[PDB]
Amino acid sequence: KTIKVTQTKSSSHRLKNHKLCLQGLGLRRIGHTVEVQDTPSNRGMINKVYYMVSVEE
Amino acid sequence: STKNGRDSNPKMLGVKVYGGQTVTAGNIIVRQRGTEFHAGANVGMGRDHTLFATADGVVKFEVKGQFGRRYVKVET
RNA sequence: GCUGGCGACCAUAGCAAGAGUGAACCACCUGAUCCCUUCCCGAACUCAGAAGUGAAACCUCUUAGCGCUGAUGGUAGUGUGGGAUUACCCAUGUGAGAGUAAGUCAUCGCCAGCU
RNA sequence: CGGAGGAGUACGAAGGUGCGCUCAGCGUGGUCGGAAAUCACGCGUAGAGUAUAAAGGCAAAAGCGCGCUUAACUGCGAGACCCACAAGUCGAGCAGGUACGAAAGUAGGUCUUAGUGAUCCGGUGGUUCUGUAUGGAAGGGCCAUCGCUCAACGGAUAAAAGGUACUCUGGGGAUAACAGGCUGAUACCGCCCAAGAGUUCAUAUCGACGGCGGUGUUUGGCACCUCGAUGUCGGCUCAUCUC
RNA sequence: CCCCGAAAGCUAUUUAGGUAGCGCCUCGGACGAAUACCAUAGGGGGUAGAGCACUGUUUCGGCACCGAUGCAAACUCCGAAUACCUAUGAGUACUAUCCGGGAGACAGACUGCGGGUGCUAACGUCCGUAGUCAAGAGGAAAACAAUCCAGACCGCCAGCUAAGGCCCCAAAAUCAUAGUUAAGUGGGAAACGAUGUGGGAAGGCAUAGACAGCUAUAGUCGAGUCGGCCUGCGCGGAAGAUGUAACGGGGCUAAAACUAUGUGCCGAAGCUGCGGAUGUAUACUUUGUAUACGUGGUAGGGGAGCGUUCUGUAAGCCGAUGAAGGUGUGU
RNA sequence: UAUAAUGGGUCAGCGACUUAUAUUCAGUAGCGAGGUUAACCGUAUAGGGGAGCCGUAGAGAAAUCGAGUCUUAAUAGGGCG
């Protein structure tokens, strides 16, 4: 029902919507791990920033 | 010396209210130089081919008729 | 089942060719007296009527001839990340146009006449 | 200081309305008459037209005729578009008075987008506003309207050209002339293909039409360094490197 | 000392290196989900591509038309991805909006992508869009604002990593397994030239005897031989001025080069560990306390303080048992 | 900008957002539908001095009306309150 997402790269130079996706998932720094509901709305934000996150499914 | 170098001010034409939005009577829907869109139900046409709403409701676009004209109407 | 009027829809519904229809309906049809009419003309519009014909017209049926509709697969393009700089390659998402197989001689509604 | 064109108007009908009508082209015949005037019948087909440039449009034709007419009205105006301001644009609907229709109705100029000029100062018409003691008046206000190539078109004044090598000040390497830098069109040098010339014979020596590079001596392009100064055309003296 | 933090744009200007309104910054007040990211649903398009149905333009046939065949910023029978507008919804986040006090700024630069101009020149010039610098330190690039990794509150002789690396200068593999190169290619470049070498798919001739050589098609001999296509890495083409000077250097050839795979390690002011300070908010319903999130900064805006001279407090308090001032030391 | 762009040979002392008036906003204090005096008098920071100023009502060019008022033929509509 829930998945864990970890930020693996810096977000300082990314696109505005990509930074907002990270913030809307709740990730705050490199190495941060959060646990979020497994819903299509959360999956969209995860997929948009796939290149700098790691999902423990 | 070039013989060119002129242009006119912009006119800001285009669609102002898209399909599925709600309107109040008097709202402008389409600014257009000619009749690219035609007025359906509850939609009026101005002297410069502007399309506006004459009733409150939801805007809907369609293609209709024997000529395939584009129509925009308002559903109450 | 045939005919007429008004609509939905706007070619898979259209054009073209061929063939049928007169009981009623419709169409031609008679001539021009009064209504009405032509920058001339009863050609159209209009009136008053049934001596003829379904010839033309309009409708109905048949035909893939012209047209129209049209996959699947592939190709081009393209958002994000990475690698390169004649404008490509990889991962991921998306995906035409043209062409090919194939389809089509429409489908419904309201009212009124004639069997 | 990119590529192409237009405007500084026109119209009392070329506006309103009711009714009515379709273009252009080609082919056949028909006196002058034919490439192409007008008549008649067909064929296929928006290729015509829309006062004017282009674009977006145009069958209920927005194109084209006829009769009657003045809605090219007055007071407005829900609601929007556009927008720094000042401005600009569309508008259903209500009241009064009209025009055309038998009528449902249509009409607040023209298919639309250019045809324009703020404020100040003055002129004209109107006005149940004001009126320096009072009654008037003059003057002022309000409503309508007139006088701009103020075109450098947000218009500094009602009113304005030149010289300076006799010159001066405040600034700029925000910006030119020298040298440096980037670039290499141009310049110079090299290579590829090879029609042909060479009595025969492309390549001893040349080498057309075309193609690919190198260098950083020319003419240039750019404006990065220097304008609180990098101060030189040639000659003299003295050089050092490349091939 | 603490907190936040721009712009080099639009419009107008006898304006262009000035200024004004708007855009962007800050502070106070009001008001709280009205906001944003993502998903789903609704919507218009005429760009990329493509095409020849219009407008132009193009070649070859047949008789302006018919059949084949190309092209287009100002062509379109067609036509995306993205972007944009609206409604609903989960989660996350101090979001959105309104009213006022104070500004600064209106010389930008480079890089990637889409273009105009220029010669598909320029560290050239003018737009759109994103990142960085400007106003940003650290690590990697030999050195190198604008590239890559990453956003510095303070202290530590603790640990893990990113980009990039692991023979020595100089931290970490002279690590492991397969190949390729002989050019110091690696560690600058084109048309073009060549039996350099590795791999691959076909084809021709041949032990009733092939290719070359050799004797007059036959003959000695005794197996392969021949000519092309695709592809990996190399070679020539390749000339400049101060001094090797086109791997940073030393040096490197079953590499310390290139290609593929794997196991470890080094590596930053990033992350973690320990100690300390400070801002904002929630709850403790004084507290000065815990928790959560923050603390790079130019022009600017806001907040809080240290010292100096003078007036009152002061006819007080300190001072020849030594004031102010000067010069050392400690804290 | 290490810049081969500007300025400074060094030390000590001096050297640049002030003052008056008006106005607006914010803090703070008094009073509060009210608040407050100016010149001046005054052996005088007191106490007197209410002229004046701000607030308490808008609309309209104005005359005028007034919680309404302007525009209009309109009690419609619309603008400011």
The residue whose two tokens read 């497994």 is A38
Longest Cα separation, chain A? 32
User: In this structure, is the CB of residue B26 within 7 Å of any atom belonging to strand C?
Assistant: no
Q: Cα(first)–Cα(last) distance of chain A, in Å?
A: 10
Output the distance from B76 CA to E209 C1' rounded to whole Å. 101
CA–CA separation, B1 and B14 (whole Å): 36
Buried b (16+ CB within 10 A) or exposed e, B42-67: bbeeeeebbbbbebebebbbeeeeee
Output the distance from A56 CA to F71 C1' rounded to whole Å. 74
Q: Which nucleotide is nearest to B38 (CA to C1')?
A: D57
CA–CA separation, B24 and B53 (whole Å): 7
For residue A52, what are the CA distances in angstroms to A2, A12, A25, B61, B67? 19, 12, 13, 42, 53
Contact B76, B55 (CB under 8 A): yes
Find and list the nucleotides of strand C having atoms within 7 Å of a protein beta carbon.
9-11, 80-81
Beta bridge partners of residue B66, listed in sequence order: none
What letter does residue B32 receive in the DSSP assignment? -
Contact B32, B51 (CB under 8 A): yes
For residue A29, what are the CA distances in angstroms to A33, B3, B16, B62? 9, 59, 42, 50
Q: Which of residues 18-47 of A touch strand E (CB under 7 A)?
A: 20-21, 23-26, 28-31, 36-37, 39-45, 47
Experimental method: cryo-EM
**Both tokens assigned to B65:** 């008729």
**Both tokens assigned to B46:** 């101005």
For residue A9, what are the CA distances in angstroms to A6, A55, B36? 9, 13, 50
CA–CA separation, B28 and B53 (whole Å): 7
For residue B44, what are the CA distances in angstroms to B19, B28, B34? 17, 10, 14
